[PDB]
Design a protein around this ligand. Structure first.
Ligand SMILES: C#CCOc1cccc(C(=O)NS(=O)(=O)OC[C@H]2O[C@@H](n3cnc4c(N)ncnc43)[C@H](O)[C@@H]2O)c1
Ligand SMILES: C#CCOc1cccc(C(=O)NS(=O)(=O)OC[C@H]2O[C@@H](n3cnc4c(N)ncnc43)[C@H](O)[C@@H]2O)c1
Lengths: 521, 524
């Protein structure tokens, strides 16, 4: 499986300083293989580390019996369910490198993922609209001839994922990929018409998990509500579900981050940490004002907020109205994660997005041409480190643009740095809408909009929204009348995630040639 | 001299109803040839009709002696001076058809006029920057080889226009072009890169003058201040200087329409009518507020306003603050002139631009495709009538576009009509900036802007201005940032009128497309 390696001098330093431990990610679970403490709660169901490790082995063995081999890839689309974790560890024990699609994702995204990785395995859920029938599977498996095996959650036919998990492994021995080779693929937020995959080696991903666990002081006391899409890296590795497993804590799954669902779950399971995006924090605070009992969240000791900038106003209300510590998390799938520390001043937690998890995370701020700007100036985030990638999968064209001559990655983010060395997010250069923490590649939606017979020119831009931070607006130049329900119907046909449907559609007589900067004015 | 004739059924009707009298325009002056009453006041100088008609004959004879013949054309550039009228009548008595350039016009406009009409005669003013030396004349007369004779005002060399006017005609007899042939060329506001000339026959132009005199009730007691550029048709024919002459009144010339100049002239000469554009009306009302004596304007009985829409607010203040009747004049060089009547309700004079001077002026309002829109709806002005042309001079390309299949002319103006039959100007489709009543063909200035090494794309659009109604803004797509003083210096080099220099310059990375959306650019 090809990826961009670190230069040998960087790999040697990263090993010398103890970042790269040369252990597979499977070691996160197998260290607990003998333990009957609860690792995962999913409604009424409670899985021990012993059961979770046995399930992963069962499924690994079953897949090996069906002909899946090390160094092959897989497409996986499971939501906030126990089988997400079982599946991730099974494929890690086989040395199969998956993409974890979010439940929200549809035809266009699954097709794009399958086209780039040529998966030998597809794992999905009959609860997903695409997979309750066999029609789309038939098309999908024809168009993506790499796929040899289909396992399906909530199926009772020949393809039941449960029969695989419940079938006891006779004599199963793990073959994880080498620790310096690809373990799995993370999804980028997206800056382009086609999705870019991020190869993560075991050395690089395990370090990001292990160090996030040190900073967040996770232990076997950690009862972590995983309520955002579990397959995103913020929910998975910062420190996320893997960080909980590492520490021998308990992960409490929830279908979504609504107060209706999460308030009962926090009180019931005595949850002491969770991860939200700003609008969820807004909705929780409003729930408490609309009369929800504050005491339901008593056990809550740490609330992580990331994916988009938390307003100082909203930040300050967390300790007052909820009565736990805040942690700002400014991370990306490409690697770098900034954290506020548990012992930081109120000043730094409320007003900044913290600083890098690694001492050898390298972060400078660049002007338009590529020169370092002195501290306090606003510029482009340039980073590289021991858990930050060196290239997207099979993307020589884009990789040429995404990295400078020294292998520094440009996040497309505008930042400033304090005299104290803390990062504040000031703006964005990348053609990306951050809708409540969920990322929309504007070019992707524009290309779909131009496919409409009526649409001559399309621009997708953010507009300020109090709850969501940004909502999506399609500016369209059209041959004929075109109402917003027509654009949305059309985009659904093409098959994209709900969060990528324009919140607003405006037909306009003209657009400048599309120069987005001029359109904002 | 070739022009687009009216169809014979239209010409026969227009003669049958007395619109087309088949008399030359010279008849406007020659009817008064025996009169010693004052026709023109120009500073200290007062010309009788007797002297004016004798001057015109003198100059006509002198030009005939220098080899100018009937059916030839001429370029004339005189400002608000007596020699404008003398020259106009001389060329009419010879059957030479002129263009009357405005003083403000420069190289690019004169060149364009001379290129289209191939003039045998050039009459200009050594007071004009282009004519104080002999350099430009030498170039001009080389590039336009049709020119055989040059007469110059404020010259004391071989080409003195005064020696021609003062040289008494021994036995001179007039040879005006036929009344159904071209008498002269009017200038359009402009909708295109090169100027379009409007052929005016004697039948058609005389009617527009004669009928405007009936409506404005001009007589020998008409003392008319001509303070706007005298060679424009509003100042010349609606009813203007010719309508004053027709009626045997007096024309008082003024270099410009400033209160400083015109207040003294109105009191001194007991002026009872004048013509302004809205911003001049603004500046006059403000002059009175800044302490000018209202009594200076007592003699003023009618103030005409047109060229651009007068706001109801501004209109209402004229009777109150100045104490004369208002007349809204919505006209064009291509023919049609709408007037409020002297006996109209205050409601119609304040809020509307009146209705057509001719009963047989035909006016309907068209949608985007060309269908009639019902009574109070907003659309394109479509007109034809006995003083409205059927084509621009030597412009087959443009004439194909400017007229529908039935010979209706589109003014490029958006209008509505009252239930009472009165026109209100609502907007504009033609690519034209109306800067205080002065007209800028946007494409003309865009073509000059693209000539600049830095300029890739140019869009010229109007922006609202309180005084002027509209100012000009150039939107430019540039190889590097370019200051406004640089565009203006560059456009002056090319040689255009001051009023055509962009009031504002904006450098942008891109321009909006639908085809450049000028409507979007007005909204910034
Ligand atoms: C995946 C992964 C690893 O860990 C995390 C942890 C928390 C957030 C993310 C994340 O948002 N990843 S992303 O791939 O979906 O997007 C990266 C982008 O989100 C933006 N972002 C993330 N956090 C913040 C923040 N705290 N304030 C303003 N913007 C922000 C920023 O544009 C960054 O480039 C990723
Ligand atoms: C030449 C001639 C004979 O008579 C006149 C009398 C008054 C004005 C004109 C004139 O402005 N002629 S023009 O060729 O310079 O421009 C024509 C355009 O000016 C505009 N215009 C003229 N008067 C008005 C008006 N009163 N209200 C809103 N717009 C207006 C309109 O766009 C019209 O098509 C011409």
């Amino acid at each position: 499986i090809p990826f961009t390696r670190w230069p040998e001098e960087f790999a040697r330093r990263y090993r010398e300083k103890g970042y790269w431990q040369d252990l597979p990610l499977t070691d996160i679970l197998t260290r607990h293989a003998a333990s009957d403490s609860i690792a995962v709660i999913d409604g009424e169901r409670q899985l021990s580390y012993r059961e979770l490790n046995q399930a992963a082995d069962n499924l690994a063995c079953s897949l090996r019996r069906q002909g899946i081999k090390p160094g092959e890839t897989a497409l996986v689309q499971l939501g906030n369910v126990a089988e997400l974790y079982i599946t991730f560890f099974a494929l890690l024990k086989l040395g199969v490198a998956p993409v974890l699609a979010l439940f929200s994702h549809q035809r266009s995204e699954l097709n794009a993922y399958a086209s780039q990785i040529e998966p030998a395995l597809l794992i999905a859920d009959r609860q997903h609209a695409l997979f309750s029938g066999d029609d789309f599977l038939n098309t999908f498996v024809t168009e993506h001839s790499s796929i040899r095996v289909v396992q399906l959650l909530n199926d009772s036919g020949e393809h039941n994922l449960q029969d695989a998990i419940n079938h006891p492994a006779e004599d199963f021995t793990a073959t994880p990929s080498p620790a310096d080779e690809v373990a799995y693929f993370q999804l980028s937020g997206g800056t382009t018409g086609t999705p870019k995959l991020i190869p993560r080696t075991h050395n690089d991903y395990y370090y990001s998990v292990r160090r996030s666990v040190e900073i967040c002081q996770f232990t076997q006391q950690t009862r972590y509500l995983c309520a955002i899409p579990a397959a995103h890296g913020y929910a998975m590795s910062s420190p996320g579900s893997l960080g909980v497993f590492l520490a021998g804590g308990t992960v409490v799954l929830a279908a979504d981050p609504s107060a209706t669902l999460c308030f009962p779950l926090i009180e019931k399971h005595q949850v002491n940490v969770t991860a939200l995006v700003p609008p969820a924090v807004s909705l929780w605070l409003q729930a408490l004002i609309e009369g929800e009992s504050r005491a339901q969240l008593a056990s809550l000791k740490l609330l992580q907020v990331g994916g988009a900038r938390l307003s100082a106003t909203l930040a300050a209300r967390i300790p007052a109205e909820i009565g736990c510590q805040l942690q700002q998390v400014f991370g990306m799938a490409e690697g770098l994660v900034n954290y506020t520390r548990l012992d930081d001043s109120a000043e730094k937690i409320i007003h900044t997005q913290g600083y890098p998890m690694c001492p050898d995370d390298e972060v400078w701020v660049a002007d338009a041409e590529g020169n370092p700007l002195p501290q306090g100036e606003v510029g482009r985030l340039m980073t590289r480190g021991p858990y930050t990638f060196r290239g997207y999968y099979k993307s020589p064209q884009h990789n040429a643009s995404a990295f400078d001559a020294n292998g520094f990655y440009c996040s497309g983010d505008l930042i400033s740095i304090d005299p104290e060395g803390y990062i504040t997010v000031q703006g964005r250069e990348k053609d990306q809408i951050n809708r409540g923490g969920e990322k929309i590649a504007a070019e992707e939606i524009e290309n779909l909009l131009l496919r409409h017979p009526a649409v001559i020119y399309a621009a997708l831009v953010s507009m300020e929204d109090e709850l969501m931070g940004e909502k999506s607006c399609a500016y369209l130049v059209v041959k004929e009348p075109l109402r917003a329900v027509q654009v949305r119907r059309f985009l659904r046909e093409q098959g994209i995630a709900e969060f990528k449907l324009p919140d607003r559609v405006e037909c306009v007589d003209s657009l400048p040639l599309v120069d987005k900067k001029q359109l904002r004015q």
